[PDB]
Design a protein around this ligand. Structure first.
Ligand code: HEM
Ligand SMILES: C[C@]12CCC(=O)C=C1CC[C@@H]1[C@@H]2CC[C@]2(C)C(=O)CC[C@@H]12
Ligand SMILES: C[C@]12CCC(=O)C=C1CC[C@@H]1[C@@H]2CC[C@]2(C)C(=O)CC[C@@H]12
Length: 403
């Protein structure tokens, strides 16, 4: 009786209360979203199990007898555009996933990330030098946002008259509003056109960047990446490379400001920063929801999910499951955050974890170390949270530098 509609304000206003209600009733339940029926998984155990079950595919390009596969993330995307966004690690199942991840991991390494620490510190310092030292500034527009973008552009060899453009496109693709569908499909074409030009430019003039590296990358047993895989991989690395990092820095600043106790704990011991980052991700996971497609009938938590169903694994809800995390609504930077699902679970585990932790640690440490009297420019209850189950974040965060 009464299936929940994920488009309602209950999933965007104090949404975590709605998750607890649902999980209590049934960790696995049928819902409606973007006009289609789906199953949402709010339980921790149920979420881990689902992400570990390979009968739940991550490939939207797959064709099934009399079935039209529709992953919500692709609302309004023309098919040619869809395939450019969907021919990479996160959009492939083994054995394709296996080789794509192997070829990329040869170049996208911890060594390459570590060598970037000096540059990310410098960029952080510059951005902070620019905000001044007094008044109210949107910490997102002046810090949280440009920091991750500069780092990903340098890593991929993207430049000046390009950056900032994909910011607005990214902004449109982040939300699925049925009425803005084609405007969504349009920004998507632009992102693609940009990438196509970027890769060809790099083929013509290779450098020390990661993208040049991926173009030459080769393996004896796996081979090389096709033009399409290369273009799709560059697209996801660019997009996923900065968007969630923005959410981490913005939500994190917001969190520490509203929990003075935890902020004091951090300023005191810098060695407590790393776990603070983990607790911020656990508390409000940017990728609140992850999508899977049931290639076969699958039983999740005693519930049979019919074949060909769309499954929304709510990573965000699972992180606040009381049986896994006691007092899940208490933001505690000292708690064991082991096992949260914010970077995924299983084969599709986040390849970008090292870079994300680097940015969050360096950013927040630099932010709060520089502004000891930093405070929220607005009332905590007035902070506008982005309406997206795909990726949570704060688009505007006014803070007072001097207090
Ligand atoms: C705040 C940090 C981030 C969070 C919360 C995050 C979260 C995730 C999650 C939840 C997944 C799994 C998605 C699924 O199972 O369908 C994932 C996958 C992935 N992430 Fe991250 N991520 C972050 C930053 C990054 C960065 C900086 C990059 C690097 C360019 C990146 C690259 C990827 C890629 C390529 C995958 C696909 C992995 C695969 O399919 O094999 N991520 N990430
Ligand atoms: C989790 C994630 C990473 C960081 C970020 O900022 C936003 C997202 C949401 C979309 C995810 C992406 C990871 C790569 C994924 C799985 C694909 O291959 C298609 C969907 C896409
Ligand atoms: C999460 C994300 C990151 C950067 C950004 O600016 C906006 C978005 C939302 C659309 C995501 C994209 C990551 C790549 C995704 C998952 C695809 O492969 C299709 C939909 C698309």
């Amino acid at each position: 009786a009464t299936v929940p509609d994920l488009e309602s304000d209950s999933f965007h206003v104090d949404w975590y209360s709605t998750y607890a209600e649902l999980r209590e009733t049934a960790p696995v339940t049928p819902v409606r979203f973007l006009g289609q029926d789906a199953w949402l998984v709010t339980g921790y155990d149920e979420a881990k199990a689902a992400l570990s079950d390979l009968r739940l595919s991550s490939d939207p390009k797959k064709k099934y007898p009399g079935v039209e596969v529709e992953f919500p993330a692709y609302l309004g995307f023309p098919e040619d555009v869809r395939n450019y966004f969907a021919t990479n690690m996160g959009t492939s199942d083994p054995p394709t996933h296996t080789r794509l991840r192997k070829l990329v991991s040869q170049e996208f390494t911890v060594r390459r990330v570590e060598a970037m620490r000096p540059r990310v510190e410098q960029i952080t310092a510059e951005l902070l030098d620019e905000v001044g030292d007094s008044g109210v500034v949107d910490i997102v527009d002046r810090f949280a946002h440009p920091l991750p973008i500069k780092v990903i552009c340098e890593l991929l060899g993207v430049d000046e008259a390009a950056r900032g453009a994909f910011g607005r496109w990214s902004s449109e693709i982040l939300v699925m509003d049925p009425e803005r569908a084609e405007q969504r499909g349009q920004a998507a074409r632009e992102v693609v056109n940009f990438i196509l030009d970027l890769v060809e430019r790099r083929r013509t003039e290779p450098g020390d960047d990661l993208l040049s590296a991926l173009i030459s990358v080769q393996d004896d047993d796996d081979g090389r990446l096709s033009a399409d895989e290369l273009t799709s991989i560059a697209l996801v690395l660019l997009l996923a490379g900065f968007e969630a990092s923005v959410s981490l820095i913005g939500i994190g600043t917001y969190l520490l400001l509203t929990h003075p106790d935890q902020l004091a704990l951090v300023r005191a011991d810098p060695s407590a920063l790393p776990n603070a980052v983990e607790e911020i991700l656990r508390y409000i996971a940017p990728p609140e929801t992850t999508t899977r497609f049931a290639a076969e009938e699958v039983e999740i938590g005693g519930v049979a999910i019919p074949q060909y169903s769309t499954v929304l694994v709510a990573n965000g809800a699972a992180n606040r499951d009381p049986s896994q995390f006691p007092d899940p609504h208490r933001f505690d930077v000292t708690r064991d955050t082991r096992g949260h699902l914010s970077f995924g679970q299983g084969i599709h585990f986040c390849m970008g974890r090292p870079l994300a932790k680097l940015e969050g640690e360096v950013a927040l440490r630099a932010l709060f170390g520089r502004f000891p009297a930093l405070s929220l420019g607005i009332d905590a209850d007035d902070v506008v949270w982005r309406r997206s189950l795909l990726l949570r974040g704060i688009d505007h965060l006014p803070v007072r530098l001097d207090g």
